[PDB]
């Protein structure tokens, strides 16, 4: 079915995103879109066999048979839309062929950014560094060495406070390591709070 779709896309909550898929097949019998949250089950979003734009709530699906082109359009993007989106093209048995999937990363809108880098101390190695409360435009490397580990960013939602925040964690087993230098190979805000 010659299916192609992008590996990854990023968008901000509240925005519109278009996930594009191309295919070429004899005996076209329809195109499906599925959503797949990281391990678990893919779930059906849409089926299109006739040309045109079909609307289903916040999501729309378009097909052009002559171009062998479909897109899934997500409006009013939500954090819960972070997932992979799979294009599948129908179809001895009606079994669609699945595309490789497009991973969509949704960034939160941070109303009151307060970038800071915090040391925190075992309970019971001995410490980690927490870079937190930065705006979603901030990119976190991936360390230079070797002896130090830096996670990707993670968005938490304090639901009752209607409050979301980004963070990344860094640590090392080595003696030289300090939180002041932990995120050096990242471009971090100049006014980044480093206590104390």
């Amino acid at each position: 079915q010659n299916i192609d779709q992008p590996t990854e896309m990023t968008a901000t909550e509240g925005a519109i995103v278009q996930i594009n898929c191309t295919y070429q097949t004899s005996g076209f019998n329809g195109l499906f879109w599925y959503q797949q949250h990281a391990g678990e089950a893919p779930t059906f979003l849409s089926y299109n066999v006739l040309d045109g734009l079909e609307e289903k709530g916040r999501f729309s699906s378009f097909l052009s048979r002559s171009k062998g082109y479909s897109y899934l359009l997500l409006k009013e993007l939500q954090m819960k839309d972070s997932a992979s989106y799979l294009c599948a093209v129908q179809a001895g048995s009606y079994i669609p062929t699945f595309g490789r999937g497009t991973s969509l990363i949704v960034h939160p809108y941070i109303q009151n950014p307060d970038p800071a880098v915090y040391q925190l101390r075992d309970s019971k190695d001995k410490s980690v560094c927490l870079f937190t409360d930065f705006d979603s435009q901030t990119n976190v490397s991936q360390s230079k060495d070797s002896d130090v580990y830096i996670t990707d960013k993670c968005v938490l939602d304090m639901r009752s406070m209607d409050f979301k925040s980004n963070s990344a964690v860094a640590w090392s087993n080595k003696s030289d390591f300090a939180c002041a230098n932990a995120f050096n190979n990242s471009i971090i805000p100049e006014d980044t709070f480093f206590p104390s």
């Binding site: 391990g39 079994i95 307060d114 925190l120 980690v128 639901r159 406070m161």
Partner: protein
């Protein structure tokens, strides 16, 4: 859920071991399917069934067999597991129609290793909130680190006063390799739980990070000094502290 269950949900075993994965459904669909999902690939069909005792091959059938002795079950067998059969396996069911979707299970992570001495459970530690965060923001972020585990078959949860919490939590979607250039490197995974400063400032509040690791079982051979890395929960905890 939607009636589809896969068993086991996780498995790690040695090359040459026979492995059977079971897909069970409730909706009595005529068709069942087994897929594998590998990085850089879409779901790829291994085998499918179009009725009781009726099965046929998919694109990646080599190394697998299936059985459909009854409507409700579709069994996938690896007669002698190979390392290349390490994957995430998804079953699905459906009516077989051109214009209706398939219904999927939640998947099974299967790790097949030449050497079981690569299998390690996590160590887990909880890092208490920074007093500087508390003063600057009136919030308190705990961090959990789960370190040194292999394979990546873990589930991390937070428990506050004996009840699982989800609000204010974020767990890394992917683990990091502790030695990125080493084959079968052990992994680390972090999670955060953020609460209000007042909630942290209660010595009666108990915060626990739990990691369930899926490991070896009775039929796997073990000859190392260290404890056999069986399926197990490893946990760490902290208590709040009065202001």
């Amino acid at each position: 859920d939607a009636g589809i269950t896969q068993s086991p949900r996780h498995k790690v075993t040695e090359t040459g071991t026979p492995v059977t994965l079971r897909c069970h459904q409730t909706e009595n669909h005529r068709y069942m399917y087994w897929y594998r999902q590998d990085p850089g690939h879409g779901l790829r069909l291994i085998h499918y069934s179009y009725g009781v005792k009726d099965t046929d091959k998919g694109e990646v059938s080599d190394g697998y067999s299936v059985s459909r002795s009854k409507t409700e079950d579709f069994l996938l067998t690896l007669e002698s597991a190979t390392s290349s059969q390490t994957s995430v396996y998804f079953c699905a069911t459906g009516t077989g129609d051109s214009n209706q979707p398939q219904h999927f299970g939640d998947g099974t992570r299967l790790s097949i290793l030449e050497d079981l001495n690569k299998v390690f459970p996590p160590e887990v530690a909880v890092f208490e909130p920074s007093e500087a965060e508390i003063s600057h923001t009136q919030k308190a972020t705990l961090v959990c680190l789960a370190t040194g585990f292999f394979p990546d078959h873990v589930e991390l949860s937070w428990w506050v006063n004996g009840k699982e919490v989800h609000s204010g939590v974020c767990t890394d979607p992917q683990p990091l390799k502790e030695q990125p250039a080493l084959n079968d490197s052990r992994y680390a995974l972090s999670s955060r739980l953020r609460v209000s400063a007042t909630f942290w400032q209660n010595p009666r509040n108990h915060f626990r990070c739990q990691v369930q690791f899926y490991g070896l079982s009775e039929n796997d051979e073990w000859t190392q000094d260290r404890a056999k890395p069986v399926t197990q929960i490893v946990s760490a905890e902290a208590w709040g502290r009065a202001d």
